[PDB]
Amino acid sequence: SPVQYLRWGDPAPIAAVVFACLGLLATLFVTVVFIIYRDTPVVKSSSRELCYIILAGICLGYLCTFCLIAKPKQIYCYLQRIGIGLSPAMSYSALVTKTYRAARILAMSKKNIFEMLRIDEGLRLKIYKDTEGYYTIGIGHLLTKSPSLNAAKSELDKAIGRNTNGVITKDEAEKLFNQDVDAAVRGILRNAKLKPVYDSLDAVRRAALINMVFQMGETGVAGFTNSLRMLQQKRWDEAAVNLAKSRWYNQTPNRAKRVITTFRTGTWDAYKISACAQLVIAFILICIQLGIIVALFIMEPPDIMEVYLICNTTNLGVVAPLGYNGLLILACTFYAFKTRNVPANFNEAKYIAFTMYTTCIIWLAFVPIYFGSNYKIITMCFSVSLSATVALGCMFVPKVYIILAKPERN
Ligand SMILES: CCCCCCCC/C=C\CCCCCCCC(=O)O
Numbered sequence: 001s002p003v004q005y006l007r008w009g010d011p012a013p014i015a016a017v018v019f020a021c022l023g024l025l026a027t028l029f030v031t032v033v034f035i036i037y038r039d040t041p042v043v044k045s046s047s048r049e050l051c052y053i054i055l056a057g058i059c060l061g062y063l064c065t066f067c068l069i070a071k072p073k074q075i076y077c078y079l080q081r082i083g084i085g086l087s088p089a090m091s092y093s094a095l096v097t098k099t100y101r102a103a104r105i106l107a108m109s110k111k112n113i114f115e116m117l118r119i120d121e122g123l124r125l126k127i128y129k130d131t132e133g134y135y136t137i138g139i140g141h142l143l144t145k146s147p148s149l150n151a152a153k154s155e156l157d158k159a160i161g162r163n164t165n166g167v168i169t170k171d172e173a174e175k176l177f178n179q180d181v182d183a184a185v186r187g188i189l190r191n192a193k194l195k196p197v198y199d200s201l202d203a204v205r206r207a208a209l210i211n212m213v214f215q216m217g218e219t220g221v222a223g224f225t226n227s228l229r230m231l232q233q234k235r236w237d238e239a240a241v242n243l244a245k246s247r248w249y250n251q252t253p254n255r256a257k258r259v260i261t262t263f264r265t266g267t268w269d270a271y272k273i274s275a276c277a278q279l280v281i282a283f284i285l286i287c288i289q290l291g292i293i294v295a296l297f298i299m300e301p302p303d304i305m306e307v308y309l310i311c312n313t314t315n316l317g318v319v320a321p322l323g324y325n326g327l328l329i330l331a332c333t334f335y336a337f338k339t340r341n342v343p344a345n346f347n348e349a350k351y352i353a354f355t356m357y358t359t360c361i362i363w364l365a366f367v368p369i370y371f372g373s374n375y376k377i378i379t380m381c382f383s384v385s386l387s388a389t390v391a392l393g394c395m396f397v398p399k400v401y402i403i404l405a406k407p408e409r410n
């Protein structure tokens with residue numbers, strides 16, 4: 001009994017149990033809130049079944065402390081190993097597929113704007129110079145600024161990764177273009193006259209504005225005061241009429257028409273231009289961890305060696321599932337970082353990225369702390385729980401807050 005130990009002067013067992021009980025309550029609160037209000041936008045477009053997997057994992061995480069603070073029964077040693085390896089995998093494997101889909105969606109948006117400008121501006125697959133004499137390739141991608149061709153080729157090879165010999169492919173031109181777009185967005189967001197229109201626009205219409213920026217620069221685009229305002233206020237037809245009066249339209253009519261039409265429809269009509277799969281993959285990434293665990297069960301059978309349950313788990317019995325989860329966390333972080341600025345679903349991505357930043361630190365810190373500790377069971381309890389609380393706190397608590405306290409927003 002954990003109360004005994006507190007009485008005997010050791011408050012660690014009861015503290016761990018309380019942490020886990022509170023963890024279970026909160027996860028229970030959050031889950032029920034998601035069951036009732038699954039009928040709402042803020043939950044529908046986000047993957048519901050995947051969310052449940054993540055919550056289940058967090059739940060099992062907290063449950064792990066009851067496996068570590070236990071009566072001496074054989075099965076608890078089995079449970080410990082199962083729970084400690086499998087519960088992070090459940091959460092992180094469902095999450096990686098979530099961040100992956102968010103990464104594909106984003107990539108295909110970058111592909112569209114690339115095609116837009118391939119059509120409007122064109123690209124060269126071989127090195128050339130701009131009107132200012134600087135070495136350039138693709139859709140106006142600046143390579144270097146020195147007057148030496150070989151310096152451009154080296155810098156290109158550095159950028160692409162193979163020995164290009166001054167010649168690249170279309171996919172590689174896209175690669176370079178993605179950078180230039182990124183930088184282009186930075187500038188718009190650093191421009192007071194342009195930030196509010198860009199923030200308010202949907203994805204397609206954002207590309208149209210970026211298109212204009214590429215043609216005239218920011219200072220030129222900011223000169224369409226009235227039109228930008230109309231766009232910001234969503235008066236699409238009026239913006240179209242207004243922009244068709246400009247000198248821009250009159251100097252480059254063929255291109256301006258496509259851009260204006262894009263602004264007017266929010267579609268790509270002027271340019272030629274699976275949830276179930278997620279569950280199967282998440283299922284697979286989880287079974288792999290189970291495979292590792294079951295294999296270590298056969299190589300190194302669990303055995304007991306009071307309130308603390310000392311099992312005979314070797315360093316390998318810990319490290320192998322730990323390593324695998326570490327890989328999942330790594331993949332999550334990678335994809336989450338990539339999609340960190342994605343505005344969709346009330347900036348859901350910003351929370352997911354922050355969560356993984358924290359997880360990485362917590363897990364990296366766990367290695368020296370745990371393997372240099374003489375209080376391993378309690379270190380494990382707090383660690384699993386902290387990791388589960390970080391996920392629950394940083395990702396689900398804000399969603400619940402929006403649900404219950406902003407019913408006029410969602
Ligand atoms: C952000 C990275 C994700 C988390 C890192 C995962 C940590 C697990 C991976 C490897 C840990 C290093 C191997 C264990 C050290 C053995 C210590 C010992 O037994 O002496």
Ligand SMILES: COc1cccc(C#Cc2cccc(C)n2)c1
Nearest residue numbers: 057058061087088366383387391
């Ligand atoms: C950092 O120290 C450790 C060591 C080993 C395992 C863990 C863990 C975990 C876990 C469980 C369920 C849900 C989530 C998000 N995480 C933490």
